Amino acid sequence: QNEGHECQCQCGSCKNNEQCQKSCSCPTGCNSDDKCPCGN
């Protein structure tokens, strides 16, 4: 499915890969590379 959730993380590292967009494992707060726990 969208095995993560709606990522929407304002991190460039997120905001590029539609993989993480739906398959990201970060909290809503993740809008900073510093605090990007994303497995993509």
CSV table of N, CA and C in Angstrom, one decimal:
chain,number,residue,atom,x,y,z
A,1,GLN,N,0.9,-1.2,0.0
A,1,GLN,CA,0.0,0.0,0.0
A,1,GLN,C,0.9,1.2,0.0
A,2,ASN,N,0.5,2.3,0.7
A,2,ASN,CA,1.3,3.5,1.0
A,2,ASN,C,1.8,3.2,2.4
A,3,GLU,N,2.7,2.2,2.4
A,3,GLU,CA,3.2,1.5,3.6
A,3,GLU,C,3.7,2.5,4.7
A,4,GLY,N,4.1,3.7,4.3
A,4,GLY,CA,4.5,4.7,5.3
A,4,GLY,C,3.2,5.5,5.7
A,5,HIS,N,2.9,6.6,5.0
A,5,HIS,CA,1.8,7.5,5.1
A,5,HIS,C,2.0,8.6,4.1
A,6,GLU,N,1.2,9.7,4.2
A,6,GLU,CA,1.5,10.9,3.4
A,6,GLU,C,2.6,11.6,4.1
A,7,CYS,N,3.8,11.5,3.5
A,7,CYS,CA,5.0,12.1,4.0
A,7,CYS,C,4.9,13.6,4.1
A,8,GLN,N,4.8,14.2,3.0
A,8,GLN,CA,4.7,15.7,2.7
A,8,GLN,C,5.8,16.5,3.3
A,9,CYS,N,6.8,15.9,4.0
A,9,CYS,CA,8.0,16.4,4.6
A,9,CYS,C,8.6,17.5,3.7
A,10,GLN,N,8.8,18.7,4.1
A,10,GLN,CA,9.4,19.8,3.3
A,10,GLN,C,10.9,19.7,3.1
A,11,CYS,N,11.4,18.5,3.3
A,11,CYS,CA,12.8,18.2,3.1
A,11,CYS,C,13.0,17.9,1.6
A,12,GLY,N,13.9,18.6,0.9
A,12,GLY,CA,14.2,18.3,-0.5
A,12,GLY,C,14.4,16.7,-0.7
A,13,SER,N,15.1,16.1,0.2
A,13,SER,CA,15.4,14.7,0.2
A,13,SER,C,14.1,13.8,0.2
A,14,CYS,N,13.0,14.4,0.7
A,14,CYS,CA,11.7,13.8,0.7
A,14,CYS,C,10.9,14.3,-0.6
A,15,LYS,N,10.8,15.6,-0.7
A,15,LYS,CA,10.1,16.3,-1.8
A,15,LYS,C,10.9,16.2,-3.1
A,16,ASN,N,10.9,15.0,-3.7
A,16,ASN,CA,11.6,14.6,-4.9
A,16,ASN,C,11.2,13.1,-5.3
A,17,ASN,N,11.0,12.3,-4.3
A,17,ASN,CA,10.8,10.8,-4.5
A,17,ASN,C,9.4,10.4,-4.0
A,18,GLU,N,8.6,10.2,-5.0
A,18,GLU,CA,7.2,9.7,-4.7
A,18,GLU,C,7.2,8.4,-4.0
A,19,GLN,N,8.2,7.6,-4.0
A,19,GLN,CA,8.4,6.5,-3.1
A,19,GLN,C,8.2,7.0,-1.7
A,20,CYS,N,9.0,7.9,-1.1
A,20,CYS,CA,8.9,8.3,0.3
A,20,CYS,C,7.5,9.0,0.4
A,21,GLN,N,7.1,9.8,-0.5
A,21,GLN,CA,5.9,10.5,-0.4
A,21,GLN,C,4.7,9.7,0.2
A,22,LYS,N,4.7,8.4,-0.2
A,22,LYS,CA,3.7,7.5,0.3
A,22,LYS,C,4.3,6.4,1.2
A,23,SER,N,5.6,6.2,1.1
A,23,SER,CA,6.4,5.2,1.9
A,23,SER,C,7.5,5.8,2.7
A,24,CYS,N,7.1,6.8,3.5
A,24,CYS,CA,8.0,7.5,4.4
A,24,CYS,C,7.7,7.2,5.9
A,25,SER,N,8.7,7.2,6.8
A,25,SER,CA,8.5,6.8,8.2
A,25,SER,C,9.0,7.9,9.1
A,26,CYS,N,8.5,9.1,8.8
A,26,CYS,CA,8.9,10.3,9.6
A,26,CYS,C,7.6,10.9,10.2
A,27,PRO,N,7.7,11.7,11.3
A,27,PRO,CA,6.6,12.4,11.8
A,27,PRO,C,6.3,13.7,11.0
A,28,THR,N,5.2,14.3,11.2
A,28,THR,CA,4.7,15.5,10.4
A,28,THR,C,5.7,16.6,10.5
A,29,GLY,N,6.4,16.7,11.6
A,29,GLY,CA,7.4,17.7,11.9
A,29,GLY,C,8.6,17.6,11.0
A,30,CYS,N,8.8,16.5,10.3
A,30,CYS,CA,10.1,16.3,9.5
A,30,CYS,C,10.1,17.2,8.3
A,31,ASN,N,10.6,18.4,8.5
A,31,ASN,CA,10.7,19.5,7.5
A,31,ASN,C,12.2,20.0,7.6
A,32,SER,N,13.1,19.1,7.8
A,32,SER,CA,14.5,19.5,8.1
A,32,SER,C,15.3,18.2,7.9
A,33,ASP,N,16.5,18.2,7.2
A,33,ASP,CA,17.3,17.1,6.9
A,33,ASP,C,17.9,16.6,8.2
A,34,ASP,N,18.4,17.5,9.0
A,34,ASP,CA,18.8,17.3,10.4
A,34,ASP,C,17.9,16.2,11.1
A,35,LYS,N,16.6,16.4,11.0
A,35,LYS,CA,15.6,15.5,11.6
A,35,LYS,C,14.8,14.8,10.5
A,36,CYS,N,15.5,14.2,9.5
A,36,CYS,CA,14.9,13.4,8.5
A,36,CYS,C,15.2,11.9,8.8
A,37,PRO,N,14.3,11.1,9.5
A,37,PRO,CA,14.4,9.7,9.7
A,37,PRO,C,14.0,8.8,8.5
A,38,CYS,N,13.7,9.5,7.3
A,38,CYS,CA,13.2,8.8,6.1
A,38,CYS,C,14.1,7.7,5.6
A,39,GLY,N,13.5,6.5,5.4
A,39,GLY,CA,14.3,5.4,4.8
A,39,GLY,C,14.3,5.5,3.3
A,40,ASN,N,14.4,6.7,2.7
A,40,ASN,CA,14.5,6.9,1.3
A,40,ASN,C,15.3,8.2,1.2
